[PDB]
Amino acid sequence: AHCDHFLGEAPVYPCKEKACKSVCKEHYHHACKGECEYHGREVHCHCYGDYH
Numbered sequence: 001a002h003c004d005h006f007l008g009e010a011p012v013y014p015c016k017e018k019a020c021k022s023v024c025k026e027h028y029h030h031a032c033k034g035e036c037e038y039h040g041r042e043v044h045c046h047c048y049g050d051y052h
């Protein structure tokens with residue numbers, strides 16, 4: 001169980017760090033952390049969790 005893995009992405013705009021972490025658990029139930037990062041031009045909510 002490491003939160004060092006990306007599980008996927010969550011569509012969160014505007015992307016708040018805490019909201020991202022929250023929406024990530026909605027999409028990916030085994031997600032623990034979510035963080036907003038800019039990729040390209042838009043901000044993506046990256047869902048961290050343990051991939052199993």
